[PDB]
Structure 1
């Protein structure tokens, strides 16, 4: 029975000169820290136990106390930034990195987990873990011919810790560290375990959330086709990070965007744009908006895949945030599209849901919609059809909205609505 000791008992045992009494009290500490009702992390920290646990990490001749203190320190490090800091301040980083070499899989796994909590605190501790040299021993834990021979929970913990080394910005992780880690991430992106795949996708989405040189580091490894495949997965915990990574990638150059189109991503968007999860619809529409901001032949691929009716559908009925992203998709489309493409977009029914959205209480979406309207009117002048479109906007209640928006707080709103009223409704 090491169940339900007091912190004072734990301190008394850890302070004895008896390694076995210390092992008993460390296991008591661990069981205290792995109950879910409010683990007394701060009392353990305050008792001054962290340096003792960290020294127990180096008792290679008593592997049980290595394990129990590794687990206790893991759970302290799982807490607030101050609690993680207390663990780091006890010298835990190099001791856990040494434990990565342990012959006992449960102990090296626990060192992997602890290092993942430390790195997961943020940029500074992530970079400190990297500077102490964790990446090579971590990656060496995966240097086997076939990932499937590793224990499931083990491989999952390693994948999660690696993704935490890829995570966070300001600054993003060191370029050389990202380059060291990426080949292993690519291998994990082809593993068959859903949880490994989800965490690998999260890591790729972190690496692609930056400037185009970061995106390019990833796209150059040729993972986009695999990301599109995962974009078609049935498991939502996979589709969410695959979609986020794909959308990050299309915020880059038109050639990076083109790699996404080339890999076949557009064929998944009918189901993504009607997906029952609001966040999937929102992120798919955001991705579409950064694709309609591309070249006219890319706008044309959007058209050929039949996606303009889906954008019309999401503009007509969706969560308001999704509708804002659809408004952006439409304004980008109209800004870059040919006149034929803008005409197509009107023929699909864009005007009425665009009008209906002008009555929303969000300034930016109203600016976005008015900009799209102006672009469509300019395509109409190019065809001498401005009267027809004026009639359409008047026929669905739009004119009332633009006129009422003449008297609006925002400067751009009233300026643009007044411009439209004078240029086309007079």
Structure 2
């Protein structure tokens, strides 16, 4: 029927003066654009069909052509930034926003999807969708007593589009829009569908990727406990965005980090720091490094949860990037920690793996490590135990590596190594 038309047949049908023929040709276009392999997006655009589709969006008396044109434009807008720009230039934004109030659920959903792609293109189109007033009707679609009464796919598409309205930076979304969206986002963050939860955590992670004021906008809504709960979920698509959100939050002030700690987040990190997925381990170690860079009572919270041995483990064996985040965590620990806490750090066996990591080719990890060593040596000086530490470093081959780093081409590297040698290995 409408399977595998040519673009010229589609153009001939859409340019006819017969609404029904236009509907058939539009459906044919939709089917061309929804095939598995290589849809002819550029050919459809070059045929000049976008304005016709946009005009079909407004044909209230023929909802089928509204749906087919909405679907076709959706799939065009799903492509490159140039194709999405083609959809926007046709005036599609206000038309889709108008369709958000359609009495037909599938048409309204299709509009939600299209706006999701357009806004998902980038900060500019995101802000333009917002300027046309999409947030009010979008959120109105979710103003029901119980989200479970909505269709699963409907709710999933709404959540996804909203998450795209929270996505991208330079600039971040307008503050007023984020405040307008955040309550519904909190509501979705408590829904029982895994995809709604994943997309909600992603949206929160977007909103927390920024200055402390944005982080505060999120944290003030009281979502941290829920974020920890989801951090303990079994579905990796949930744990990943939840962990990213937590990390972002702990990049903020010590009080926000403290709200993460009070929610019980640390209790989850024994598993996260041994998670079989590399990215979970890396992001968890990065989060930890942003915790050990905080107050001494917070470092002490890290200690009490038994997470220092897990850091020693990651530093001993893990993907190199995860090991680098571990080195950062150690250097922050030693920078802000007390003498007792640094002593405890050595008692857990940090020295040997820390030394082994000096044979890495990455310059910055060598710098980080040498700073950590400097700090530990400072604690030893404050305890008069520097000799024993020098012996520790010498028995595991660390002294050889430092002495060799004296010949390292980087300035700060061979500076720090020279200082360590002449000050503690004479």
* Bin for the TM-score computed over the shorter chain: over 0.9
Is 2:31 aligned against 1:31? yes
- Paired with 1:389 and 1:220, the residues of 2 have a C-alpha distance of 45
Deviation digits for residues 140-195 of structure 1, max 9, x if unmatched?
00000000000000000000000000000000000000000000000000000000
Report the alpha carbon displacement of residue 36 of structure 1 after superposing the two structures with TM.
1.5
- Paired with 2:293 and 2:16, the residues of 1 have a C-alpha distance of 69
> Which SS does the other structure have where 2:383 is aligned?
coil
5+ residue gaps, structure 1, are none
- Paired with 2:134 and 2:162, the residues of 1 have a C-alpha distance of 10
Report the alpha carbon displacement of residue 256 of structure 1 after superposing the two structures with TM.
0.2
Deviation digits for residues 323-368 of structure 1, max 9, x if unmatched?
0000000000000000000000000000000000000000000000
Report the alpha carbon displacement of residue 65 of structure 1 after superposing the two structures with TM.
0.1
Aligned residue in 2 for 1:68: 68
- Paired with 1:409 and 1:120, the residues of 2 have a C-alpha distance of 45
Report the alpha carbon displacement of residue 80 of structure 1 after superposing the two structures with TM.
0.2
- Paired with 1:389 and 1:200, the residues of 2 have a C-alpha distance of 48
Q: Name the TM-score, length of structure 2 as normaliser.
A: 1.00
Aligned residue in 2 for 1:258: 258
Deviation digits for residues 255-308 of structure 1, max 9, x if unmatched?
000000000000000000000000000000000000000000000000000000
> Which SS does the other structure have where 1:290 is aligned?
helix
Deviation digits for residues 40-75 of structure 1, max 9, x if unmatched?
000000000000000000000000000000000000
Report the alpha carbon displacement of residue 252 of structure 1 after superposing the two structures with TM.
0.1
- Paired with 1:36 and 1:81, the residues of 2 have a C-alpha distance of 20
Aligned residue in 2 for 1:235: 235
Deviation digits for residues 61-108 of structure 1, max 9, x if unmatched?
000000000000000000000000000000000000000000000000
> Which SS does the other structure have where 1:8 is aligned?
helix
Is 2:114 aligned against 1:93? no
- Paired with 1:408 and 1:305, the residues of 2 have a C-alpha distance of 38
Report the alpha carbon displacement of residue 235 of structure 1 after superposing the two structures with TM.
0.2
Deviation digits for residues 219-245 of structure 1, max 9, x if unmatched?
000000000000000000000000000
Is 2:187 aligned against 1:197? no
Report the alpha carbon displacement of residue 139 of structure 1 after superposing the two structures with TM.
0.1
Aligned residue in 2 for 1:139: 139
> Which SS does the other structure have where 1:382 is aligned?
helix
Report the alpha carbon displacement of residue 21 of structure 1 after superposing the two structures with TM.
0.2
Deviation digits for residues 356-406 of structure 1, max 9, x if unmatched?
000000000000000000000000000000000000000000000000000
- Paired with 2:5 and 2:207, the residues of 1 have a C-alpha distance of 44
> Which SS does the other structure have where 1:16 is aligned?
coil
> Which SS does the other structure have where 1:76 is aligned?
helix
- Paired with 1:354 and 1:333, the residues of 2 have a C-alpha distance of 13
Deviation digits for residues 127-146 of structure 1, max 9, x if unmatched?
00000000000000000000
Report the alpha carbon displacement of residue 111 of structure 1 after superposing the two structures with TM.
0.0
Report the alpha carbon displacement of residue 126 of structure 1 after superposing the two structures with TM.
0.1
The two structures, once aligned, show a CA RMSD in angstroms of 0.2
- Paired with 1:200 and 1:212, the residues of 2 have a C-alpha distance of 20
> Which SS does the other structure have where 2:248 is aligned?
helix
Report the alpha carbon displacement of residue 212 of structure 1 after superposing the two structures with TM.
0.0
Is 2:271 aligned against 1:271? yes
Aligned residue in 2 for 1:288: 288
> Which SS does the other structure have where 2:294 is aligned?
coil
Aligned residue in 2 for 1:304: 304
Aligned residue in 1 for 2:20: 20
Q: How many residues align?
A: 426
- Paired with 1:387 and 1:237, the residues of 2 have a C-alpha distance of 49
Runs of 4 or more consecutive aligned structure 1 residues displaced over 4 Å after TM superposition: none
Matches within 5 A, 1:15-414: 15-414=15-414
> Which SS does the other structure have where 2:52 is aligned?
helix
> Which SS does the other structure have where 1:144 is aligned?
coil
5+ residue gaps, structure 2, are none
- Paired with 2:353 and 2:400, the residues of 1 have a C-alpha distance of 14
- Paired with 1:299 and 1:5, the residues of 2 have a C-alpha distance of 66
Report the alpha carbon displacement of residue 205 of structure 1 after superposing the two structures with TM.
0.1
- Paired with 1:190 and 1:58, the residues of 2 have a C-alpha distance of 36
